[PDB]
CSV table of C-alpha atoms and ligand atoms in Angstrom, one decimal:
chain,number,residue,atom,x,y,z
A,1183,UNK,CA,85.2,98.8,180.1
A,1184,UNK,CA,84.4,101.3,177.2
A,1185,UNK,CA,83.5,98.4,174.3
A,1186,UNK,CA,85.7,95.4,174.3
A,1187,UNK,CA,87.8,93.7,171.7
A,1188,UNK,CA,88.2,90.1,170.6
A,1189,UNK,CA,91.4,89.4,169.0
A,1190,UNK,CA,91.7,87.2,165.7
A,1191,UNK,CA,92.9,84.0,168.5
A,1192,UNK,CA,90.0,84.7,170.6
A,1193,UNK,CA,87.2,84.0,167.8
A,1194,UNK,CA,86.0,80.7,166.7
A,1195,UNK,CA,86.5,80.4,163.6
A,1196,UNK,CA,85.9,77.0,161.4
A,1197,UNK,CA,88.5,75.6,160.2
A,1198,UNK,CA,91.1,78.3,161.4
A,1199,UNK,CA,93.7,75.7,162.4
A,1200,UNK,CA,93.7,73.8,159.2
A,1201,UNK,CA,96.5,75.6,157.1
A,1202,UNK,CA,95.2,74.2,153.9
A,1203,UNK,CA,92.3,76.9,154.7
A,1204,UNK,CA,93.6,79.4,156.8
A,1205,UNK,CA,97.2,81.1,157.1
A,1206,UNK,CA,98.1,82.6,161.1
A,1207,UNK,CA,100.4,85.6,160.2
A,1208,UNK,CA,102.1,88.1,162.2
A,1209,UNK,CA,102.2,91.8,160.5
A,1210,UNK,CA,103.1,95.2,161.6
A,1211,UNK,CA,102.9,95.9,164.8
A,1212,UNK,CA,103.4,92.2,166.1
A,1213,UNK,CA,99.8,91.1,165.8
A,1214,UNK,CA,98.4,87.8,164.9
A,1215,UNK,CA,95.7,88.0,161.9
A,1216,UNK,CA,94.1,84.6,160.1
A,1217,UNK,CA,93.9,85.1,156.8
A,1218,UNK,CA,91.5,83.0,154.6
A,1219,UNK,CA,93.4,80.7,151.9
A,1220,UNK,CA,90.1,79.2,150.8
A,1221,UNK,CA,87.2,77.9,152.3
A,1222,UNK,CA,83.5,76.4,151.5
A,1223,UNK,CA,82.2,76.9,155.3
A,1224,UNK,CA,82.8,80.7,156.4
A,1225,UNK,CA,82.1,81.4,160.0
A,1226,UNK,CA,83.5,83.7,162.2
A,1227,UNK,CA,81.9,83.9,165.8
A,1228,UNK,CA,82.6,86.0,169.0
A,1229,UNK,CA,80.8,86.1,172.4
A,1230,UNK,CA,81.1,88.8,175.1
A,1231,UNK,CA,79.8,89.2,178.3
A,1232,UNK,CA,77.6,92.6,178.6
A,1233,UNK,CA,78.5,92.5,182.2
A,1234,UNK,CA,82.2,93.7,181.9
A,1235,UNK,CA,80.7,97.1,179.6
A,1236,UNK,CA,79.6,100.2,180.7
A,1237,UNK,CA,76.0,100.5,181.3
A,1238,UNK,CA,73.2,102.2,180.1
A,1239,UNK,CA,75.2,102.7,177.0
A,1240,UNK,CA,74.2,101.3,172.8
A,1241,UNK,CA,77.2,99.5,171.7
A,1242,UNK,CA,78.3,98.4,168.0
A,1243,UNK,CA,80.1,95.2,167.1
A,1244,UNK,CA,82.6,95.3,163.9
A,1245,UNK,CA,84.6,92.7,162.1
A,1246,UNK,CA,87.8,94.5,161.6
A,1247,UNK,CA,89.5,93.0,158.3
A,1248,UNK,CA,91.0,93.7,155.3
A,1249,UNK,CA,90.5,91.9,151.6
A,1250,UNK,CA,93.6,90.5,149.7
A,1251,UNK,CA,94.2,91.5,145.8
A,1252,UNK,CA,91.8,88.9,144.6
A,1253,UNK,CA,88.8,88.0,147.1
A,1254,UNK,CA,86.3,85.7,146.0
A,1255,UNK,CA,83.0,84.7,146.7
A,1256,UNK,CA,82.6,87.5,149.2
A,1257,UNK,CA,80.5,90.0,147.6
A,1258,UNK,CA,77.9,89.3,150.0
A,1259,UNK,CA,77.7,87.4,153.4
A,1260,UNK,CA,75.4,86.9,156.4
A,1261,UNK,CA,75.8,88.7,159.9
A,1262,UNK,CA,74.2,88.4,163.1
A,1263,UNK,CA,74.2,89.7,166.8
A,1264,UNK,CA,71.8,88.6,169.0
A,1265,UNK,CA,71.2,88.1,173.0
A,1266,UNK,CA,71.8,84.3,173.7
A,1267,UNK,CA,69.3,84.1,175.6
A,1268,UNK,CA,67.2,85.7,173.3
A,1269,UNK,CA,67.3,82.8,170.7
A,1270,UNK,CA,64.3,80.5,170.9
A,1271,UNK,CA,64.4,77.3,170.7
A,1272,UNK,CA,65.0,75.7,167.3
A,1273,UNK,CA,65.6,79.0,165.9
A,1274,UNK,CA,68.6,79.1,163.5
A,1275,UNK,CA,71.2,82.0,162.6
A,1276,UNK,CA,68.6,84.8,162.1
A,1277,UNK,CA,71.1,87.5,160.5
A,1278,UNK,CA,71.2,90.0,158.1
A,1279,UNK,CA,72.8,90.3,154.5
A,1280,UNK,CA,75.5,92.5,154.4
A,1281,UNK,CA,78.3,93.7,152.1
A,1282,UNK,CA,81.6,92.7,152.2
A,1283,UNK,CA,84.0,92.4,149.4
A,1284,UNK,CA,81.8,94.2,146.9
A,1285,UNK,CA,81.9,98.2,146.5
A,1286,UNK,CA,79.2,101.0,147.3
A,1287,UNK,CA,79.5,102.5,143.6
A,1288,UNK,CA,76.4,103.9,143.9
A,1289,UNK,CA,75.3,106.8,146.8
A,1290,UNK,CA,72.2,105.9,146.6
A,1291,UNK,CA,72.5,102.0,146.5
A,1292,UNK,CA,71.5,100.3,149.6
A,1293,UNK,CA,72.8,98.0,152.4
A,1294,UNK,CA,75.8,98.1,155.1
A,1295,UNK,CA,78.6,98.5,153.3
A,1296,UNK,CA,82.5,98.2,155.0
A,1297,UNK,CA,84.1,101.5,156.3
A,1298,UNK,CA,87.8,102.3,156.1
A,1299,UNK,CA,88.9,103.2,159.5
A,1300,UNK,CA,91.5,105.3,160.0
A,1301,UNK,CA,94.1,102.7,161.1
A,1302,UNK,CA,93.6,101.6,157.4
A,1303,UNK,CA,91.7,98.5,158.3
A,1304,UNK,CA,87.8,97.6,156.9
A,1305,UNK,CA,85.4,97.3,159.3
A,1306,UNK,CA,81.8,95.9,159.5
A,1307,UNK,CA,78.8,96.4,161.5
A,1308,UNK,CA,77.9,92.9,162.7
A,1309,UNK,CA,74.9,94.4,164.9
A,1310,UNK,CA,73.9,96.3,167.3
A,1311,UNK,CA,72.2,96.2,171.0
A,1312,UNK,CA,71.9,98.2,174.4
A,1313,UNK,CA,73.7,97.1,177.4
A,1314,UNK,CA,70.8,98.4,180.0
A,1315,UNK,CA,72.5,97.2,183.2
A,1316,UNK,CA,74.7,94.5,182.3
A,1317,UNK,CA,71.9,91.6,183.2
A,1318,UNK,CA,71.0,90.4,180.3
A,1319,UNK,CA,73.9,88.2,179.8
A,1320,UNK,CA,75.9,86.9,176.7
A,1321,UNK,CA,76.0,88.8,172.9
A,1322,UNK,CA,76.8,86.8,170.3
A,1323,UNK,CA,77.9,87.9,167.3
A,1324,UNK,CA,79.0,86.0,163.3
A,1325,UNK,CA,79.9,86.4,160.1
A,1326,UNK,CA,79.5,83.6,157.8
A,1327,UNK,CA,79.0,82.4,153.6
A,1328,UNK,CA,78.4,78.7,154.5
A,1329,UNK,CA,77.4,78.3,150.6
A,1330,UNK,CA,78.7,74.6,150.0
A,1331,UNK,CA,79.1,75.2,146.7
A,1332,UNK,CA,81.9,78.1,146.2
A,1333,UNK,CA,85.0,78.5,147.5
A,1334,UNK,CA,85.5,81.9,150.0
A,1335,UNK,CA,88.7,83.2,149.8
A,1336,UNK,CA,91.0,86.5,150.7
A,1337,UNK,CA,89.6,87.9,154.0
A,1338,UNK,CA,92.2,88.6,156.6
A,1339,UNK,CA,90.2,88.3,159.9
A,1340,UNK,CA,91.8,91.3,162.6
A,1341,UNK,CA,89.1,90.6,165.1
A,1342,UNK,CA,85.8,91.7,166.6
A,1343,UNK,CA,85.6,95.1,167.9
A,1344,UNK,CA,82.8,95.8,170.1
A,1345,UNK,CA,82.7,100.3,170.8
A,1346,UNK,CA,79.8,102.7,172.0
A,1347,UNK,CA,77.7,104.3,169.0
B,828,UNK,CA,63.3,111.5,177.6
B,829,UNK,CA,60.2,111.7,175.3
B,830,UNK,CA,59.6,108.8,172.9
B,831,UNK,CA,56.6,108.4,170.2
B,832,UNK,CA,53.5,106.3,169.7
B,833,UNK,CA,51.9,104.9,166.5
B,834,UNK,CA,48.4,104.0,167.4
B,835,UNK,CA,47.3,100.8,165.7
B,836,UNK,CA,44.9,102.8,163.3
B,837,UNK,CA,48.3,104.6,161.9
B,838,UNK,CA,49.9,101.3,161.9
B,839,UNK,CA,50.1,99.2,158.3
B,840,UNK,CA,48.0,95.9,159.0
B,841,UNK,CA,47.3,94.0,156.3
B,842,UNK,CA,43.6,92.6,155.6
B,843,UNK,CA,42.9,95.3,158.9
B,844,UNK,CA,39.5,96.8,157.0
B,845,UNK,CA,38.4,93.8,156.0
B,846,UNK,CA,35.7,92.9,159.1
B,847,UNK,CA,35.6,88.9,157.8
B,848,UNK,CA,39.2,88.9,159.2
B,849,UNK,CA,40.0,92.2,161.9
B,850,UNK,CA,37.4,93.5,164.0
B,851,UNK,CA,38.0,97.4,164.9
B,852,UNK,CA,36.8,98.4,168.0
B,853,UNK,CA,36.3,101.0,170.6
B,854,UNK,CA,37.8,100.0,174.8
B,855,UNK,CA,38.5,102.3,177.5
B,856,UNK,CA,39.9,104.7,177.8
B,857,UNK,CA,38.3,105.6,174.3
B,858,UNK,CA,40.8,104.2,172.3
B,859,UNK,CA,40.4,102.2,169.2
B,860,UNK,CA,41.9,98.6,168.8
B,861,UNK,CA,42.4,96.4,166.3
B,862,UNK,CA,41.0,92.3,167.3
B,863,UNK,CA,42.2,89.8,164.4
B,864,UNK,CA,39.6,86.9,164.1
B,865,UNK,CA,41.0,84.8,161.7
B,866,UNK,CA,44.3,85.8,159.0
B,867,UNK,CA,46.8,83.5,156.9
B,868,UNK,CA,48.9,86.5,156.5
B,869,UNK,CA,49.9,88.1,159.6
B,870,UNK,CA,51.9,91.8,159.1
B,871,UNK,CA,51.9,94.2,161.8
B,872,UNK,CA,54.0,97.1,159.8
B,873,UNK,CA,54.7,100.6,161.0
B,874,UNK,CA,57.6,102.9,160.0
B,875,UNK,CA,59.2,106.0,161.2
B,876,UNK,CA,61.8,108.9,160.1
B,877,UNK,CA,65.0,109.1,162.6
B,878,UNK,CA,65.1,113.4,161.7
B,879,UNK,CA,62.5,113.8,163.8
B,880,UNK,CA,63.9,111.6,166.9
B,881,UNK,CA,66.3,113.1,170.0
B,882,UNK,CA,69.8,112.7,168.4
B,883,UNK,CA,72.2,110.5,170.1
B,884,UNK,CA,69.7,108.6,171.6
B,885,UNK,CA,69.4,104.7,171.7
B,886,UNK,CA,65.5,103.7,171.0
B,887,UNK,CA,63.4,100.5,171.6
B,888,UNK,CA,60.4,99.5,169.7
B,889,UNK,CA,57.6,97.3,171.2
B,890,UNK,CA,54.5,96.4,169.8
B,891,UNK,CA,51.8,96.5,172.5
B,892,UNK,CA,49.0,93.9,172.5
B,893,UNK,CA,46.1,91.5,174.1
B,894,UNK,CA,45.4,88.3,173.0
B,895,UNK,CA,42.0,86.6,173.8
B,896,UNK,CA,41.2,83.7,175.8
B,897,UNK,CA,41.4,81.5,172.6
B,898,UNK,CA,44.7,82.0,170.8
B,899,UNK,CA,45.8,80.4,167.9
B,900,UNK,CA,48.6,79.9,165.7
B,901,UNK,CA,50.5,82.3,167.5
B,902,UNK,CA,53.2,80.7,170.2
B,903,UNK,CA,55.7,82.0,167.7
B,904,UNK,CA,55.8,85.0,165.6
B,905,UNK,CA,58.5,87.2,163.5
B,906,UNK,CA,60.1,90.4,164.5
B,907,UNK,CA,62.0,92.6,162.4
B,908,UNK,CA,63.2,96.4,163.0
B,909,UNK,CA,65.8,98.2,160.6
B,910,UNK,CA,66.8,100.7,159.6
B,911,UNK,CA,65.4,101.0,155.5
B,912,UNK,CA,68.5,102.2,153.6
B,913,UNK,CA,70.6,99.1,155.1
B,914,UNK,CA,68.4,96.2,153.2
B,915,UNK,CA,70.5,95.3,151.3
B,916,UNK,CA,69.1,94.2,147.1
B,917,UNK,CA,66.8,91.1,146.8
B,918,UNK,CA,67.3,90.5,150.7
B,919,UNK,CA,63.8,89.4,152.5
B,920,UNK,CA,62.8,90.8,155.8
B,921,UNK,CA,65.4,88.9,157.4
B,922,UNK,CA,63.9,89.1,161.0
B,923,UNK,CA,64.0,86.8,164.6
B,924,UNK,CA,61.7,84.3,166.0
B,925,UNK,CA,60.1,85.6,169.2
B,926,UNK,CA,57.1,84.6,171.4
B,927,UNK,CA,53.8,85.6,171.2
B,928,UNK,CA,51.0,83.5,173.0
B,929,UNK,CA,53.4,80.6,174.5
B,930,UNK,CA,53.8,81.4,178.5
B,931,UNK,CA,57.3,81.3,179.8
B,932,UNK,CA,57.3,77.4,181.6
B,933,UNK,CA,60.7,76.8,183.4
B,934,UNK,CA,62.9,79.7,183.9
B,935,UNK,CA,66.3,77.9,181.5
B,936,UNK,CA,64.1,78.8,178.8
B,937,UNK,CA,65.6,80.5,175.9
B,938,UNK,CA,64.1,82.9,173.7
B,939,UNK,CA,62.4,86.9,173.8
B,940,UNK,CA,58.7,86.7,176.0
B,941,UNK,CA,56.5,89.2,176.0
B,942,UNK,CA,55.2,90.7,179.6
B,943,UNK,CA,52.9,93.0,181.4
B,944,UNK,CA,52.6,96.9,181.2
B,945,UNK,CA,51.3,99.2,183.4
B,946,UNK,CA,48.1,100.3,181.5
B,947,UNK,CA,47.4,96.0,181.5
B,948,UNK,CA,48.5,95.3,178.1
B,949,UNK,CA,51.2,93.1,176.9
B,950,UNK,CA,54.5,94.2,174.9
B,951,UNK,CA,57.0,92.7,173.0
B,952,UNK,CA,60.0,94.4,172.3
B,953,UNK,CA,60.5,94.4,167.9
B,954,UNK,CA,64.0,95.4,168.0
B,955,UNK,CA,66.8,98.0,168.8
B,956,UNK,CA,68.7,101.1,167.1
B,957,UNK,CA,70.6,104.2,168.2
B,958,UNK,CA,69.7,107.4,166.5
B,959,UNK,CA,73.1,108.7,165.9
B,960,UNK,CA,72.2,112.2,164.0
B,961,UNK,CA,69.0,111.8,162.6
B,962,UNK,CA,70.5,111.3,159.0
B,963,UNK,CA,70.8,107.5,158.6
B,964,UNK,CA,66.7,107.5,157.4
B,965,UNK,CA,63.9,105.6,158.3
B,966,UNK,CA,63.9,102.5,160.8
B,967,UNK,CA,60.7,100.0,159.6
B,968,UNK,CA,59.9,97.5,162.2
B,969,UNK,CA,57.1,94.5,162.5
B,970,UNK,CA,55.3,91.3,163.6
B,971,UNK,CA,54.4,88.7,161.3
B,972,UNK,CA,53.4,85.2,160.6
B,973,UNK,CA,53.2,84.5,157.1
B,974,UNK,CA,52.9,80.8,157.3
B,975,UNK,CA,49.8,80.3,154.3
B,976,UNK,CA,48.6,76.8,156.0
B,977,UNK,CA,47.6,78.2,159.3
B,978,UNK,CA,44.8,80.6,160.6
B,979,UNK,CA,46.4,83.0,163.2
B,980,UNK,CA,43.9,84.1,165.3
B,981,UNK,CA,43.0,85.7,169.0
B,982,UNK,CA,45.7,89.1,169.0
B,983,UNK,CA,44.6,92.5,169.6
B,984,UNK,CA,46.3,95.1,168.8
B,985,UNK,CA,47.1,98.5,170.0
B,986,UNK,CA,49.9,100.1,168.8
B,987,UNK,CA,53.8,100.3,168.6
B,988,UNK,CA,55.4,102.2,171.4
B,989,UNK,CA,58.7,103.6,170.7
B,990,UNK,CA,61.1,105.1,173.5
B,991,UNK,CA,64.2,105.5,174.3
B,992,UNK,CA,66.3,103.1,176.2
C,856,ZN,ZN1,80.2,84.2,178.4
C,857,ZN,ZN1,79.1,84.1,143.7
C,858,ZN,ZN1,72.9,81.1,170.2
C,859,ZN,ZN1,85.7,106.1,160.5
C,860,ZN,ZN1,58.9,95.9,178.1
């Protein structure tokens, strides 16, 4: 209907069911959130079908987290949202840089920073796109640090939440 | 519903008043056009301010062309639209691979074509955003092939066409 949301469970996320990288947790009230132990290759991907949502309406899709007491490696990280039939072929993740872990200190400083929302969870904006009539199909939608080289870790992963601008 | 249009003489095109490499000319109805002849650095830029925009308002930007009988160089191209205070520090233009010259063959095939207006020219949509309250700045979108080995060559140009979805 109005927006959608993708629970923690419903995303594919790499690695998720290894518990040497990821920890499944229940918290307060009785839902299931995968928090990030450590991990080299970050991805977090949803898909939703624009037919379900109300038409002729601009939606925005969050990642709805929160950070542990000692993140690292996730000062930065790449997001995208795109129609999936929209991707040519050959065409890689074509995303955007965005902020995660790090903090806006500046008002002036640029970028999409995370926003605390007012059930105390971090959110943030994956992408954006219009849902004309519902006929354009699939939107897909990641975050992801795939940097082989450092370890990702202290990102509890709530789910995708897709809502109207 | 009123949206705006950047004719391609208000348009940032690089090399543009050089005639060696883009031919300005006149074509009915009395409008003046932009023909590239031969450029190793393609970038169609334009830029505009949300304040002055309908609030609350979900807008599409497409950059409206020709191409010749002779094309080159440009089955593929870069889009990019967003908004200017979300690039984040040392990011690049971080944009998506659409087509430009190559025709649609079977319809399975993947990826954003452009397709026929109206007044006869083509269009091909840059990008999305909603313009919540007019305050979140500017929104710069454009085409480009930057690829220094090849000649892009055959695309004429007549402006971006902004309106709302
Ligand atoms: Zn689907
Ligand atoms: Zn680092
Ligand atoms: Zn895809
Ligand atoms: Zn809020
Ligand atoms: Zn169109």
């Amino acid at each position: 209907g109005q927006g959608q949301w993708i629970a923690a469970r419903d995303l594919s996320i790499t690695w998720v069911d290894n518990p040497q990288y990821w920890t499944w947790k229940t918290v307060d009230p009785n839902i299931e959130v995968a928090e990030l132990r450590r991990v080299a290759w970050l991805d977090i991907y949803g898909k939703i079908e624009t037919k379900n949502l109300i038409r002729k309406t601009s939606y925005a899709v969050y990642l709805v987290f929160k950070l542990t007491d000692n993140p690292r490696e996730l000062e930065r990280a790449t997001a995208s949202l795109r129609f999936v039939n929209e991707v040519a072929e050959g065409a890689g993740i074509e995303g955007t840089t965005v902020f995660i872990s790090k903090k806006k200190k500046l008002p002036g400083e640029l970028g999409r920073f995370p926003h605390l929302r007012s059930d105390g969870w971090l959110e943030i904006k994956l992408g954006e796109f219009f849902n004309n009539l519902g006929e354009d199909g699939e939107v897909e939608m990641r975050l992801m640090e795939i940097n082989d080289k450092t370890w990702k870790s202290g990102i509890i992963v709530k789910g995708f939440d897709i809502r109207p601008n």
